[PDB]
């Protein structure tokens, strides 16, 4: 229940390969496009199917 | 010894002090070893008015933190005198 030996740098760096985050799924709005999220109402001018709700 | 001007030190000017002063009451700071009777006589002699009652109270010191050092301020004693209705008013400027 206690590590037998210390961990080197190669093993640490190898294990961290999948610890990362991806880009968001985003697209611009037809009116005053501001590169909002897909299937969401934008907060400045990404007017979802009409007016810009917020 | 025990001159009367040695008992009174300085007047007190706050909002509470002026509110009380509206009703012929006056607030002073007095020597820490003087009882109410010397305060009464001293007020009578210095200003020449009529005194009815005196109330007295003690205060402790406060801790301050100027810089990286610490200390304490000095103790105080406060008196509130009430003149009679006929006596003139003391010209506290």
């Amino acid at each position: 229940a206690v590590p037998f030996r210390r961990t080197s740098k190669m093993k640490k760096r190898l294990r961290r390969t999948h610890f990362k985050l991806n880009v968001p799924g985003m697209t611009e709005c037809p009116s005053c496009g501001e590169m909002k999220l897909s299937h969401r109402v934008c907060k400045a001018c990404g007017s979802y199917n009409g007016k810009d709700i917020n | 010894m025990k001159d009367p001007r040695d008992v009174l030190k300085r007047p007190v000017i706050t909002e509470r002090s002026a509110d009380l002063m509206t009703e012929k009451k006056y607030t002073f700071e007095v020597d820490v070893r003087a009882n109410k009777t010397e305060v009464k006589d001293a007020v009578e002699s210095i200003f020449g008015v009529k005194v009815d009652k005196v109330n007295i109270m003690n205060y402790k010191g406060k801790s301050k933190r100027v810089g990286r050092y610490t200390g304490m301020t000095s103790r105080r004693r406060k008196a509130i005198v009430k003149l009679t209705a006929d006596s003139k008013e003391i010209e506290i400027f």
Binding site: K20, L21, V23, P24, M26, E34, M35, K36, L37 | -
Partner: protein, 109 residues
């Protein structure tokens, strides 16, 4: 080719590299949208320093912002605050509060 630094903003460097990896190499206009659509905690700070770099390029060198791309986007580490937390049976383990330096360089493509 202007730059901008943060210098001892209170955040653990390992958690800021996670976003600075995302932002590096892209084009300046696209960069801000990704930065303010990401839900992490270092995104507002990185966005502020990037805006400062763009403004430096605009005023001091008259370089225009329709071409800029991000060239250097590293994160360093700064001084540490050491605290304590009492455990069971009088033990008092140790706690670290880390800091970081943030640097961004913008260049004309």
């Amino acid at each position: 080719q202007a730059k901008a630094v943060a210098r001892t903003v209170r955040i653990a460097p390992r958690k800021a590299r996670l976003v600075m990896d995302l932002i590096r190499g892209k084009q300046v206009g696209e960069a801000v949208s990704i930065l303010n659509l990401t839900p992490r905690a270092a995104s507002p700070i990185i966005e502020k320093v990037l805006k400062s770099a763009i403004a430096n390029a605009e005023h001091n060198y008259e370089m225009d912002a329709n071409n800029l791309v991000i060239s250097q986007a590293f994160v360093d580490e700064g001084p540490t605050l050491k605290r304590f937390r009492p455990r069971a049976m009088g033990r008092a383990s140790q706690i670290n509060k880390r800091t970081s330096h943030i640097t961004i360089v913008v260049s004309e493509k």
